[PDB]
Write a protein that binds this DNA or RNA. Structure first.
Lengths: 85, 80, 127, 82, 205
RNA sequence: AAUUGAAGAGUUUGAUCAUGGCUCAGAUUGAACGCUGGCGGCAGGCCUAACACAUGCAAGUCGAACGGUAACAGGAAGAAGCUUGCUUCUUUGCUGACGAGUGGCGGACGGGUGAGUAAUGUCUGGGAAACUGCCUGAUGGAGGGGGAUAACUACUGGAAACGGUAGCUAAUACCGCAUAACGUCGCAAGACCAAAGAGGGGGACCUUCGGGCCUCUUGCCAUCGGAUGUGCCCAGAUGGGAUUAGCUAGUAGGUGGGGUAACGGCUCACCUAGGCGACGAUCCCUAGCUGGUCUGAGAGGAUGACCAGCCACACUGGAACUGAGACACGGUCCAGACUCCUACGGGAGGCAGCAGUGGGGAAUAUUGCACAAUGGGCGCAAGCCUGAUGCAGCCAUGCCGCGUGUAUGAAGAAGGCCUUCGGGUUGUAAAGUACUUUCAGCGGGGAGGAAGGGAGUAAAGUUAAUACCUUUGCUCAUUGACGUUACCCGCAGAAGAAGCACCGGCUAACUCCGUGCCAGCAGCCGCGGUAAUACGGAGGGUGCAAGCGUUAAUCGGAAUUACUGGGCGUAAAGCGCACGCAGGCGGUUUGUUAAGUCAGAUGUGAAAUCCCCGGGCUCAACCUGGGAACUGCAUCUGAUACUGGCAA
């Protein structure tokens, strides 16, 4: 407040709005993956899986979605689709 | 030989699970009498079919659900 | 108010003078303690028709508290005697409200007002 | 992270430093892994003044520890007194 | 610190001199020796078991010239030591610098000896020492300093220095104003003068 | 070198012996009060309202990540008045820079506090299913492009705080694509994920003569490792109360889905019906804990400020973001209490940071100085910041050192006090004489805390480069906040410097006068009603000392809750008596196991600290080397008499 950390105040907000937008796209895609899994179309599930893999590792490298979470997602969402296929 | 202990059952129905009473003998520091202290532990065990009076060997493990961080290894005899 | 400030050599010596002046204020305390008993024999009131008023007073300015307290002891009659107990300077505090709770008196302050630790006594017993 | 640094436990206008390996996020007198030497400012004509086990310090430096500037000078001083 | 009173009043109360005068006179003449220490003091010699303990405590303190808190500090220090506690007590009492000055005879009295240590005249192992309660150790040379050595103060002492006691727990010169402390004082040097087996008991009353 | 450690007295009766309480002598304190107080060293100093706060300060930093001139300091060109060769004044990022701003990292550390918190915490010993900034070792890449936007300009709303509209512009900011195993996910085949440049100098090729390009330094990225740090889990131990006896629905377990960095009722859905409980659940009251400190002969008890470790909290209440790390002491949002400013429309705050103030209370401090040193933040370094820290101020609070003179001195002066009025005492004390001058007072001198860093040189290493830079030597300039430093030398002259309690018995130390069961003394039993060794006063005496005494506080003494280490016929104390479950204990013989127990070994048991042996501060206190202690615990290997288990 009193000291010059008004800079850090505006820095966290802009990065938040940036990260939230990518996290929003990340989740809307993962639910549209899990839509296909709930639907039981194994080809459309695998097509949607082939859609999410670049994006999930890309956010993992950006780091906001975080590394071991991203790997556990690719593992978990594999395990349903390769029962379906 | 990696860490293990030994006790008795007193466990009803409970799938993949057993509870295990471990008795030990401890000196009270002031008066010096040795009194038997009872450390009751919840235990995991798939294929749960130990008898109530059965006496069981035991070992530590990861949390296998809460309170259950021990696992059985061998059981001596069958009580009834 | 109305007397002399002088700059001095050292702080330690002006503790020792101040403690001598406190001894002098104790000489003025013992003077004011002796005077009341020998003026009329009694500790307070000579005749049996006794009435008094007590007040507790704090003015914001210390020159004022000493002057107007004298003018409140001026106006008194013999039959009902009015007297100050515990003249203060500045804001009303916990112990000031405690004196008029202990012995009944009216608690007044000039431009002076109550503070939180006075309010705590006042909300308990509204003097 | 570990730093080799001098901690001040001596008397008023008469220090006595204790060279020690300790974490950065802990106060000057705070937690440390082990003691490793000592430094009296008045070494004088008595037969000890600066003492520091180099087999411990070169080991911790090799594992990655950095050296405060005084201790860094004192290591290249104290040698075998060579 | 120091007593600062009539010296003979202590000597009559304690019941023998503490050597607070020259020894020309006044152990039998000026003193009223043990006759009465104060105005009603003619009329009692009876005493309690606490009083005989305290009197020897006071005798020893009034000999060595030390206060009750400091004397307690010596008793506590004698206690942690191995070997006899009474013996190490009397060793700590004898081990004072002003006491070695009194033994050398550099100061005629213990008070003049303390004056001489105070006034910066004394050197031990070539250090100067103003502190009265310095302790003199095995293989400590001790001396009065060269600069203003052997003034009228020391010179007057040296005559009665020639023939009193002069024992062997110091090496004594007094020609160039020095001494050497080799052996410690031992039990037979200073026992029976003091009830030491009693004095060591008393703090557990 | 390391086991030398333990006391009792007074008091119930006419008198005695018991029992048994009460009381005192001891040590100790973050102390207060009372009276008195010279100097020095060291240590320590709001334990009350987690009550509220004026004013100042408490973390920012990189132009060597970037637009930039808002600085302002030079230089140059040019435009100009001349001083006529220079000053002057407009331009100009040319150049040493550098505000506001953009980006990165630091803001999650240190510091303060003890409210809540009885274990989810803490301590000890173990563990498995985990992550971990910066910082290092290893192995390799560091390709090619793109779009914005604040600042800044032009408008515009505002009392102020604080903004609005529209364009323009860069980056180690942001976003695509290429590139990708030893990595992630998969059985495999495979799929997919990164990049950033910046800086110094230089021959050659050449350059839209900006640099291309070379070479050095550093940063960027991915991965396997290190050490560190943190999360997690389990056992045992770690306040009080039974006039708290029943307690638990996500409760207890399973399966599956989801969730976290990760185990996990962590959370859902569904299934099952359990879980905890006399070894004290639950509830209530009460409290930060330990290494330790204090006391104690030891065993024990009390205590947890100082110091350090850990935990918890940051006006009240709750949540999330950013980021490696926070559910964030001087960040954010919202809600609440409350406080302030105001042009009244609308805005602002969280000193349990350092100082400091109100209030509280018996009571705990200077609105100081400095980054000189140590340790930090940022940075390549310089450098800058550092109320951490180093220092100083204040206080007899504690510990400890020292002084307030020494020697001589009988006529044993006068006075005071007593006095059988013979004398005695105060008292060698004074007086007098002869001496010394510490520490003060005053005038002179002067260590160490300073090693480094900076700048200049040389070597060596490096390189296409005698370059150029670093490393490693040399040399020269320097670097003290405290500071009138510690410490030393010279001078005058006993000059400047002793008080306080107590004296019936306990308990060391006695008379006289006054008062007269009054006034008062009292910690205890008790003193005083005219001859008071106990009141008041004096004289005398004793203890202790710059302190003394009282009070409050804790342990002791107290074997007076009794493990070590107690009683219970009649003194307090055996249930009215019996049967009986849980519990405690168990004849005698053999075998066996080796839990208890006993032995050995390893690891660990933080350091400070206590103890034992040493060193250094003018000497001690204090500081400090080394050892022991580290009284415990766990695991592992052994022993088999005893107890337990098991077998006959």
């Amino acid at each position: 407040n009193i000291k010059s950390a008004k800079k850090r105040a505006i820095q966290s907000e802009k990065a938040r709005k940036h990260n939230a937008s990518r996290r929003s796209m990340m989740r809307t895609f993962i639910k549209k993956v899990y839509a296909a899994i709930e639907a039981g179309d194994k080809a459309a599930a695998q097509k949607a899986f082939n859609e999410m893999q670049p994006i999930v590792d890309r956010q993992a490298a950006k780091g906001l979605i975080h590394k071991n979470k991203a790997a556990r997602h690719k593992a978990n969402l594999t395990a349903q689709i390769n029962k379906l296929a | 030989k990696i860490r293990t202990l030994q006790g008795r059952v007193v466990s009803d129905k409970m799938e993949k699970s057993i509870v295990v009473a471990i008795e030990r003998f401890v000196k009270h520091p002031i008066y010096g009498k040795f009194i038997k202290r009872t450390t009751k532990l919840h235990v995991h065990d798939e294929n749960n079919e130990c008898g109530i009076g059965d006496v069981v060997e035991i070992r530590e493990c990861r949390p296998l659900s809460k309170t259950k961080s021990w696992t059985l290894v061998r059981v001596v005899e069958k009580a009834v | 108010a109305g007397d002399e400030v002088t700059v001095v050599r050292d702080e330690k010596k002006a503790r020792e003078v101040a403690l001598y002046r406190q001894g002098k204020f104790r000489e003025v305390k013992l003077a004011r303690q002796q005077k009341s008993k020998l003026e009329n024999m009694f500790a307070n009131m000579t005749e049996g028709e006794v009435h008094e008023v007590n007040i507790v007073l704090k003015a914001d300015v210390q020159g004022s508290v000493e002057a107007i307290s004298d003018s409140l002891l001026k106006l008194s009659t013999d039959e009902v005697k009015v007297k100050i107990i515990g003249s203060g300077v500045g804001g009303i505090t916990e112990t000031d409200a405690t004196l008029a709770a202990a012995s009944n008196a009216i608690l007044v302050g000039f431009n002076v007002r109550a503070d939180a630790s006075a309010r705590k006594v006042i909300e308990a017993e509204s003097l | 992270m570990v730093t080799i640094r001098l901690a001040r436990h001596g008397a008023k206008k008469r220090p006595f430093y204790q060279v020690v390996v300790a974490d950065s996020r802990n106060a000057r007198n705070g937690r440390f892994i082990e003691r490793v030497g000592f430094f009296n400012p008045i070494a004088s004509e008595k037969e000890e003044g600066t003492r520091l086990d180099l087999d411990r310090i070169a080991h911790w430096v090799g594992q990655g520890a950095t050296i405060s500037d005084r201790v860094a000078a004192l290591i290249k001083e104290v040698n075998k007194a060579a | 610190a120091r007593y600062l009173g009539p010296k003979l009043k202590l000597s009559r109360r304690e019941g023998t001199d503490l050597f607070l005068k020259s020894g020309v006179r006044a152990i039998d003449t000026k003193c009223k020796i043990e006759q009465a220490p104060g105005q009603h003091g003619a009329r009692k010699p009876r005493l309690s078991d606490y009083g005989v303990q305290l009197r020897e405590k006071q005798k020893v303190r009034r000999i060595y010239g030390v206060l009750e808190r400091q004397f307690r500090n010596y008793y506590k220090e004698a206690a942690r030591l191995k070997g006899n506690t009474g013996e190490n007590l009397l060793a700590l009492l004898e081990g004072r610098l002003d006491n070695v000055v009194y033994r050398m005879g550099f100061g005629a009295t213990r008070a003049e000896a303390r004056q001489l240590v105070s006034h910066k005249a004394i050197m031990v192992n070539g250090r100067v020492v103003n502190i009265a309660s310095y302790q003199v150790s095995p293989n400590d040379v001790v001396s009065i300093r060269e600069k203003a050595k052997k003034q009228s103060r020391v010179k007057a002492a040296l005559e009665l220095a020639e023939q009193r006691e002069k024992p062997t727990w110091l090496e004594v010169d007094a020609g160039k104003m020095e001494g050497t402390f080799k052996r410690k004082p031992e039990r037979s040097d200073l026992s029976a003068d003091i009830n030491e087996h009693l004095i060591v008991e008393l703090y557990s009353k």
